[PDB]
Design an enzyme around this catalytic site. Structure first.
Site, mmCIF file in Angstrom:
data_model
loop_
_atom_site.group_PDB
_atom_site.id
_atom_site.type_symbol
_atom_site.label_atom_id
_atom_site.label_comp_id
_atom_site.label_asym_id
_atom_site.label_seq_id
_atom_site.Cartn_x
_atom_site.Cartn_y
_atom_site.Cartn_z
ATOM 1 N N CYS A 160 48.727 -50.590 90.373
ATOM 2 C CA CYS A 160 49.341 -51.911 90.309
ATOM 3 C C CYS A 160 50.798 -51.916 90.777
ATOM 4 C CB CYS A 160 49.235 -52.446 88.880
ATOM 5 S SG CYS A 160 47.660 -52.046 88.081
ATOM 6 N N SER B 143 44.233 -63.388 80.914
ATOM 7 C CA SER B 143 44.461 -62.180 81.690
ATOM 8 C C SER B 143 44.751 -62.563 83.132
ATOM 9 C CB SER B 143 43.245 -61.246 81.632
ATOM 10 O OG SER B 143 42.721 -61.172 80.319
ATOM 11 N N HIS C 33 46.791 -61.797 90.977
ATOM 12 C CA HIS C 33 47.221 -60.400 90.860
ATOM 13 C C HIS C 33 46.450 -59.519 91.842
ATOM 14 C CE1 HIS C 33 48.517 -56.599 89.498
ATOM 15 N NE2 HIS C 33 47.688 -56.426 88.481
ATOM 16 N N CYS D 96 53.856 -52.687 85.535
ATOM 17 C CA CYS D 96 53.071 -51.586 84.999
ATOM 18 C C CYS D 96 51.907 -51.264 85.934
ATOM 19 C CB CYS D 96 52.546 -51.936 83.606
ATOM 20 S SG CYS D 96 51.411 -53.359 83.556
HETATM 21 CS CS LIG Z 1 43.696 -66.271 84.485
#
Ligand SMILES: [Cs+]
Ligand SMILES: [Cl-]
Ligand SMILES: [Cl-]
Ligand SMILES: [Cl-]
Ligand SMILES: [Cl-]
Ligand SMILES: [Cs+]
Ligand SMILES: [Cs+]
Ligand SMILES: [Cs+]
Ligand SMILES: [Cs+]
Ligand SMILES: [Cs+]
Ligand SMILES: [Cs+]
Ligand SMILES: [Cs+]
Ligand SMILES: [Cs+]
Ligand SMILES: [Cs+]
Ligand SMILES: [Cs+]
Ligand SMILES: [Cs+]
Ligand SMILES: [Cs+]
Ligand SMILES: [Cs+]
Ligand SMILES: [Cs+]
Lengths: 395, 396, 396, 395
Positions: D89, D249, D351, D381
Site C-alpha cells: 500500500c 473500509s 484505494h 500504512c
Molecule cells: Cs467504502
C-alpha cells in the site's frame, strides 16, 4: 422375452485395461472404442464392417471427447457413415445398457447388425472451469476434477463412491479383513488367468506409435498385488475405523470393449456362427447411496426375464466396484464365490467406467468357455442407485 | 411396426426456451429436465409419478452436470428411486432418440410407463483445462469452450456446424436472401403463435424464487428479438464477404427441456387413461458428417415407411431449424411445401437447447396438430456428425 | 562527484546455488531462496548482528502468487527484525543490481547505516494466469497465460520474446550461430573449471532440503549439462533455418537468490568491520526496447565515469549473459577482451534467475577479483524493456 | 544534500472495482497521470525526464516492468531509467522517496515518481500446471487476495487486521461508521466545490463502433454513500461482533498518480516554478498484523527527518485503509480530525493500492492550496507491518 426375435452375439473384443495415466493414457476414448469395435468385427467370418447398421456405445466422462463419442468410435473403426450412432451414459453400467439397447433395436426390427459396448479414458478426463461465462468478480475459485464430478460423486449426498462403499460395509457387516481377503483372492484369480493365457483371446493388443513401437498386450493392474502392503495400508475414506482401501477398491482406468449382435434372419442369411445367445436382461435401482447392492435387484430380474433359475447359472460376473460390493451382493443373493468372477474382477483388472459393463460380458464369455459352462449372468451396479444385468447362453 | 405393440403419448410439456446466459441461465440442466418431467406427468389424469418405471433423457454437454443427468432429472421431478434412468447423446437428435428408446422399451415389454425427452443448459456448459493431470511445463495453455468442443464442432473435420451449413447453401443453391426471408417468416410464425396463446398449453412456466422478488419466466425468450432491418444488414457469421449463414438466420444457443409420457396399451386400459397421440413409427439415418444438414431427407422417408404412412398424408412437419438453410434444403429435397412446416415457428426463432430440441419439437408438433385440427405429424432433426432422427405420430 | 557523499562498503555477499527450471531448488519459493542468501551473507560479517540491518531492497520480477511484498518475506524469513524497512524492486533482469544501487543511495542520503540488498527468483514457481475470470468471457476458447513469458521474457511494446531480439542483436553486430556457439562452450568451460577448482565454494550457501537424512544442493545445476556435440547440432530456437540463437547458447530459466550487506563508513569503524569491497559508482542506461542487448554498452561507461575510473583499469568484468550474443556484442562495442570477462563463466552456463542475476554476478565478481588477484571490477546487466545497470567495485 | 522540488502533480479519477476505468490497464492509467503531470510544468519538456520510479503491487499479467510501460506510454524518452517498486500500500510514496534520493545523490535532475494500480484487471492464478495435479479439485488463486490483501504470515485478509486495530485501541462499529460518513461528506463537498478539479486529469474513453464517447471526470466512490444503508448492513470480516464493513473500509479501485521532481539546479536552470519542496520522509515497520498503526512510527520519523514538529503541520493525509486506521493513528499521535483528510479519504475516494501513496500526496497539495496551509504531511500504512510518511512545504 421368448416371444421376441432372438439376438445372437457373433463376437466380442476388448482393449487391455490400462492404469490411470499409465500404458493407454495417450489414447482418447474414441481411439480405444474404435480399436475394440474393429477387433470384434474382424473375428466374424462372413460379416463385413459395412454390414453394421447401428452402434450404441457407453461413455461416462465425455467432456472434451468431442461430438458424440459413439459416432467417433464407429467411424474410427471403419464403419460406414450411414451407421446410426448413440452414446449412452448410465455411469458404471453404460457399457451393459448399451448392449441391451442394441439388442432391443434388433428385437423391434430396426436393425439386423448392431455393435454395442463402451469406452472410457479416465486418464484424459479434464478439469472444469465452471463460471468463466458469467464471471466471478472476487475470491478464489475452483477447478473441478471431472472424474470426481461426473464419474465418482453421488449427486444428492455429494460424497465419493468410497463413502458409499463404507455404507455397504456397515449395512451388510463386512470388515476390513473380509474385504482384504476378497481382494487378494480376486487378484490371484486374475494373475492365474493372465499367466495361463486365458485373456489372450478376448484382448486385442494395442500398438503405440514409437524410440521404437510399444505393444500393450496385458491388463496393467493385476501384477500390482502385494498382499503385505494390501493388509497394511491405511483406509482411504474414513481414518481409523475405515474398511475401504485403494487396494481393495477398483482403480481408475482406461479401456474399451465391444460385442457384435445380429438377428436370427441375418445369422441365417450370412451363414454366421453365433458365439452366444442373449436370453434376457434387467435394470433395477434403489436409494442412490445404496447403489452398491442394486445388482441384488437387477440380477433376479434379469434371470426372470431370461426364464432361467439362479441355480442354473454356471458363472456370474458381479462387477467389483469395490471388494465389499461383490461380498454384499453374493451374501444378499446367496451366490457362492466359487461361481463369481472366475478370472478375477475389476478390483484386480481395472474399472474404465463407461466400458466395464461390456468388459465383464467379454470376460464372462471367456469364463464360460474356459470352464465348460453354458449359462452366464453379468451384473454391474452404477452411481446414482442403479444396476444392470444380462443373461447369456454360450453356444 | 403394425405388428409391434402400440405406444401411446399421454402427455408432454416443455420449459420456456431461455436465451444464452438469459432468463433460465441460473438453472442447471437437471433442474430444467425435472421441471418438464413433473409438468408433463401432472397432466395425466389417473397416472401417478410413482407409476413411472424408466426414463431416457437427452443431454449433450454433460460436463459438470454430475453423475447421470437423466437420473438427476428423474429424481428432481419426484420419481421413485426405483426408476431406471439413462442419459442419451446423439448430439442435436438426443431428445428424439431418447423417445425412440423409451417407445422400444415399452414395445419389448420391459416397461409400461416411460418418461422420455431431453434437456440442455448451454449457459452452464463449462470450459475445460485438458492437461492439468500430467502438467504443461512451459507455454500459454488453452481453456476449451465445452459448447464448441462437445456441442458445435464436427469431430472429423474440426469445423463448426455453421461452416457445414455454408456447405449446405453452396451445395443446394440457397442465397443469403433466401435464408433471411425464411428466418423472418419463422420468427413471424413464432410471434403469432406466442401472441395467440398457442404455446400456453405446452409450456410450463418456471418460477425463480428471489434470493429480492420472485421471477416467473413464461414465454420463449428469442421470438421477440426479430429486427428485420438489422437481420438483413448483419455481416455473415462464418465466411466473410461471400457468407450466407448469419447469427440471426441460424439457431441460437439456449437453455430448456422437454418431456413426453409414454404408456403401453395394457396400462392405458388398466388406468383408463386418455391418450393424446399414438407413435406410429420412427427412423434414424446418417450420411457424410459435413452433410448432416440434409440427413433428415433420409430419416423422414424412413420414419414414414416404418409408420406405413405416405408423405402426402402428413398434416404438419417439424423440421428442426438448426439453420434456416437446413429447413430450406430438406423442404426442397423432400418436396414438402413450407405451409406444412413448423407452423408455429422453429428453432431459429424459438431457440435450440441441443439436448432438448428433439423432444421440444415433438411437444410443439402435438400443439400444432391440435390447433390446426390435424391428425398425422412428422418430426425430423439433424445432428452433428452426419445423423438425423425422425418420428411419426397420430393425434387421437 | 561521489566524494561529496558518504562511502558505502560491501562487507559480505552470498548466493544460493542456481537451480534448473523445475530442478533441484524447484520446491522452494522465491522468499525462501532470498531468506537463505540474506541469512548466509550476514553470517559472514564478524561483529555485525542481523538485528543491525535497518532496510532491505530486494529484486523480484515474476512476483505473481509470491504474496505481499516479496522483499519483506525474504527479510522476515532471514530473521531480520520486524522494524526492518523492506521494498521489492522490479527492473526485470537488472532488479538485483538496482536494488543494490538503491540500498547504497539510502546510506548516502543518511537514512540507514546497515542495508541488505540483492534479488531472488523462483521461475519454477511462476504460475499461469487466468486474466478474464472477473468479468467473464461468454463464448470461445480462452487462454491461460504463462507468467514467465508475459512478465519475464516478452517485450511489452512489440510483444516479442527477448530471444527474437537477441536474433536482432546478432544481425545488428555480425555474430554467427558458430560464433555464439563457440562462446557458449567457452563460458561453459570457465564455469566447469571454476566448479572443478572450488572457486564457487565461498560465495555459494548450500541448501538443505528436509527429507530421514537431508538432501543438500551444493552446486549450480546447469554447468554440468554441456554437450558440445548436441550444442552445435541443435536446431535454432526462434527462427527456423537462418536463426543463430539457440537454447544452449541462451541463458536458461532458473531459480536462485543472492544478497550483499552494505554498511556506512561510520558503522564499518564503529563496530570494526572488515570491508570486502567499496562501491565506487554505478550507472543506469536505456535505449530502444528491442535493442536492450547493447544497453550495457551505455550503462558500463556511465558507471565508470560515475566512479572516476577508466575501462583499462578494470581487472575483471561481469557482463551478464542473457544470451551469448549479448556478451559478444557488448564486448565488441566497448572494446573489452574476453580474457577479462566472466572469468568463472556467465549466465549461459550458470543460470539466469532473472530477479537475482544482478546481485548474483556481483557476488561472483568479488570471487573473481579474489581468485585472479584484481582490485577493480565492473558488473553490467541488461534488462528487457531497453535498460541496463552497471556497478563498479574496488576490492579492499 | 540538494533540495528536491515538486513542480507538478496529477492523478487519474479513482475508478471503482470493475467500474469506470476497468477497461484500462495499470500502465495506461500510469501513463495518463505522467503525461498530465508533465503538461503542467511550462519550461520542462517531457524529454527532460531522466528516471521513473513507479509503484505497482499486483503486477501479474501487466507485462515487463510496469513502470517502463508507464514511462513509454506517457511519451518519455526511451533513454529514461524506469523501476517498478512494491511496498504494497505504500508503493506510490516509497517510489517518490526513491526519486528524491536519486536527485539528492546527483544521478538525476528530473524524476517522475508515483504509482498505479488496476485491481479490476488483476488476474487469477493457477499455481500447479507446470508439475501437474493427477487427481482432485484444484484452486484458482485470486491475485488481489494473495499479493495485495493477505498478510503473508497470518494468512488473513486485511479486514481482519482491521478488527485487531479496533479491539486494540477501542473503536466500535458506530465510531467507524460515523467517521466513514464524515469523510464521505468531506469528499462530496469537494466534488461539488471543484477542489479536486486541478489534481484530476479526466480520462477519455472513445467509442467508435457507433457507441458514444465517455469521459470520466469524477471519483466513482464518493457518490455511493447512503447512511441508512451504511449503518444497517452486516459486518464484513467478523459476523455479529465485527466492526469493519465494506462501506466503512476502503474499496478495491483503479487509479494512478504522479509527481514531477526537479533538482535545486534544474529549478533555477530552467526557470521553473516549484509547487512545493520535499522536506523529509520516514519509513517504519513493526509486527505485520499491527501494520494499521505503523504510521504512528513513520509520521514522527518523517517529521524528525524534516526538522518539523507535529504541531506545525497544517493538514495531514493519513490514508484510510480502513476507517479504524485513521481513527487509531489519530489517537496514537494526538491529531485532531479537523486537520486530517480535508477533502475526504480512501474510504470514500477509493484505494488503488499501488497508487494511493502518490494519490494522497497529490490531494495533500490540493488541501494545502485550499486551506492556505504551508506544512503538510502524508503517511500511509502497508501490508506486512510497514508505513511511509512524507512532509512537504507548499511554496
Ligand atoms: Cs467504502
Ligand atoms: Cl441410476
Ligand atoms: Cl451421427
Ligand atoms: Cl528498461
Ligand atoms: Cl512491511
Ligand atoms: Cs470379418
Ligand atoms: Cs460365413
Ligand atoms: Cs486376440
Ligand atoms: Cs485395486
Ligand atoms: Cs449350474
Ligand atoms: Cs397426475
Ligand atoms: Cs400449461
Ligand atoms: Cs436467431
Ligand atoms: Cs394431408
Ligand atoms: Cs555474524
Ligand atoms: Cs560458503
Ligand atoms: Cs544454456
Ligand atoms: Cs510542458
Ligand atoms: Cs486538470
Amino acid at each position: 422375452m421368448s416371444s421376441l426375435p432372438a439376438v445372437y452375439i457373433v463376437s466380442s473384443a476388448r482393449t487391455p485395461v490400462g492404469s490411470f495415466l499409465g500404458s493407454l493414457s495417450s489414447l482418447t476414448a474414441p481411439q480405444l472404442g474404435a480399436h475394440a469395435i474393429k477387433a470384434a468385427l474382424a473375428k466374424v467370418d462372413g460379416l463385413k464392417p459395412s454390414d453394421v447398421q447401428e452402434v450404441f456405445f457407453g461413455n461416462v466422462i465425455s467432456a472434451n471427447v468431442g461430438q458424440n463419442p459413439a459416432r467417433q468410435c464407429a467411424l474410427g473403426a471403419g464403419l460406414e457413415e450411414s451407421t446410426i450412432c448413440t452414446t449412452v451414459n448410465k455411469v458404471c453400467a453404460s457399457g451393459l445398457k448399451a448392449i441391451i439397447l442394441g439388442a432391443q433395436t434388433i428385437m423391434t426390427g430396426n436393425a439386423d447388425v448392431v455393435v454395442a459396448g463402451g469406452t472410457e479414458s479416465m486418464s484424459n478426463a479434464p478439469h472444469y472451469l465452471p463460471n468463466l461465462r458469467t464471471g466471478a468478480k472476487y475470491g478464489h475459485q475452483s477447478l473441478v476434477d471431472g472424474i470426481m464430478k461426473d464419474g465418482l460423486t453421488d449427486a444428492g449426498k455429494q460424497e465419493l463412491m468410497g463413502l458409499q462403499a463404507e455404507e455397504c460395509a456397515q449395512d451388510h457387516g463386512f470388515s476390513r479383513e473380509q474385504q482384504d481377503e476378497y481382494a487378494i483372492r480376486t487378484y490371484e484369480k486374475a494373475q492365474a488367468a493372465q499367466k495361463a493365457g486365458l485373456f489372450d483371446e478376448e484382448i486385442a493388443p494395442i500398438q503405440l506409435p514409437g524410440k521404437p513401437d510399444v505393444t500393450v498386450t496385458q491388463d496393467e493392474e493385476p501384477k500390482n498385488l502385494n498382499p503385505e502392503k494390501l493388509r497394511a495400508i491405511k483406509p482411504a475414506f474414513i481414518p481409523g475405523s475405515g474398511t475401504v482401501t485403494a487396494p481393495n477398491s477398483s482403480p481408475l482406468n482406461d479401456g474399451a470393449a465391444a460385442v457384435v449382435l445380429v438377428s436370427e434372419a441375418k445369422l441365417k442369411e450370412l451363414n454366421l456362427k453365433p458365439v452366444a445367445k442373449i436370453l434376457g436382461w434387467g435394470d433395477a435401482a434403489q436409494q442412490p447411496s445404496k447403489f452398491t447392492t442394486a445388482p441384488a435387484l437387477a440380477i433376479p430380474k434379469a434371470l426372470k426375464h431370461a426364464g432361467v433359475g439362479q441355480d442354473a447359472i454356471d458363472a456370474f460376473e458381479i462387477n467389483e466396484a469395490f471388494s465389499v460390493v461383490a461380498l454384499a451382493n453374493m451374501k444378499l443373493l446367496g451366490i457362492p464365490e466359487e461361481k463369481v468372477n472366475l478370472h478375477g474382477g475389476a478390483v484386480a483388472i481395472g474399472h474404465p467406467i463407461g466400458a466395464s459393463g461390456a468388459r465383464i460380458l467379454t470376460t464372462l464369455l471367456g469364463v464360460l468357455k474356459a470352464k465348460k459352462g453354458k449359462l452366464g449372468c453379468a451384473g454391474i451396479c452404477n452411481g446414482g442407485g442403479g444396476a444392470s444385468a444380462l443373461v447369456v447362453e454360450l453356444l
